[PDB]
Symmetry: D2
Subunit: 141 residues, 4 copies
């Protein structure tokens, strides 16, 4: 089905100058960008965004990194978007991405397992929460 998912381009990929190349890739893969915004998470807001992950490994590291500089979020819409976007971005470990998916976003622009260029929603439930965390319905266009 046609679905929406959230991506966030992380500060490592921002600093590498990869934003445009990353957006181009998703456009060329057939996704419609329905919302797009550069913003800066406060540490508190990054913590709230990652509320679910608060029990998973590296919560504080993630919150600190994701509030350490500006980021860009986008809502991507298309057939099977949640899974397809995950395939395009590649394995969480950027080094592993280079071994198994050389043209994935993380292979191309990621450094390691933490500085790995990009976030994407991992499920329908996460996508619903994450999209509303960043974008109101009024911002969808």
């Amino acid at each position: 089905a046609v679905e929406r998912t959230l991506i966030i381009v992380k500060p490592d990929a921002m600093e590498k100058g990869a934003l445009g190349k990353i957006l181009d890739r998703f456009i060329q893969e057939g996704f419609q960008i329905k919302a797009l915004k550069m913003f800066r998470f406060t540490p508190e807001k990054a913590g709230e965004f990652y509320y679910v992950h608060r029990e998973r490994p590296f919560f504080q590291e993630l919150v600190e990194f994701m509030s350490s500089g500006p980021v860009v979020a986008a809502v991507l819409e298309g057939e099977d978007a949640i899974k397809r976007v995950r395939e395009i971005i590649g394995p969480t470990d950027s080094e592993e991405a280079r071994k198994v998916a050389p043209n994935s976003i993380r292979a191309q622009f990621g450094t390691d397992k933490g500085k790995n260029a990009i976030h994407a929603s991992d499920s329908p439930e996460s996508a619903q929460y994450e999209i509303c965390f960043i974008f109101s319905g009024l911002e969808i266009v």
Copy 2:
């Protein structure tokens, strides 16, 4: 339990100059305002917000009215907020509100059953939808 609900001050109450009195009432009733802004629904966005009413009487008039001038929305937080806010605003029909709840928002500022000053979420599930329609998580402070 502590809940969040959405109110929208409609263009009738806006034009009557009642916005401040309405906000004051909810503050004095013990609610925390977690988000607030003035915006203007396009007809398309008003229709999406009210999508549940699409097949009901006076839907087109509702959409036109709600997009006819700026409105102000607020997220209100407090114990039993959804039910308590609906008790404070009074019956949909502003005339009936004047009969049974003279100090309700609709009794005080509502004209009739359509131009009835204020919208509030009906239920937990509609509050979740409506809050996300108007406000992102980044706007809740």
Copy 3:
């Protein structure tokens, strides 16, 4: 001439529950609210907003105070708005306001010369800067 000015309801008045009463006053004084929202200054953003005061007494306390909790800003439009809004809010020193203007905003809701309930633009040029700092043209409705 018709002018626009910016007000910010400061965290002291927010915590006192005065937001609605303050907005009501400006509505009743004949101003059009052209933009409105609740937000939270980061310390950095509060410092930029108040950059003119950077070398003045109590600047650090001003920045901390103004970033200590959410605030609400509004753009007010009307004839001679900049001067009239400053007459309505009263002297900076809330105690002096109680002596000379008992129904002024600062007399009614201000604590002292620092926690003085409300900010308003000083001049046409500062209004232009301050309005743009908080609100884009897209938010003026």
Copy 4:
């Protein structure tokens, strides 16, 4: 000097899928993206954005086109940004751009003089107005 300018990627380039390639170009040319947003101008808001141009040729055509689908605006910051961005985008007439500046944005993605892919501020005064029309200071990051 280091300056800020506004670009808006117009609906023609949006529909061609050129957004990412356009942003990449400005990143590679050395500009910092300080704000970025996808939004939809209402006809009224496009008219206000182009207030200055309201006497120049093709006002209504421009307003209609710029409100006909979503657009993406960005604030670009860098040395001599206003002029350098204009050089990168090329002549207003996309056909002329192809003749004299084949790698300009308008040569690459523009169709003609109206569907010409991109807007950029034409002067310091225009940049100041245009940036504030789309982005508040709070949105600069």
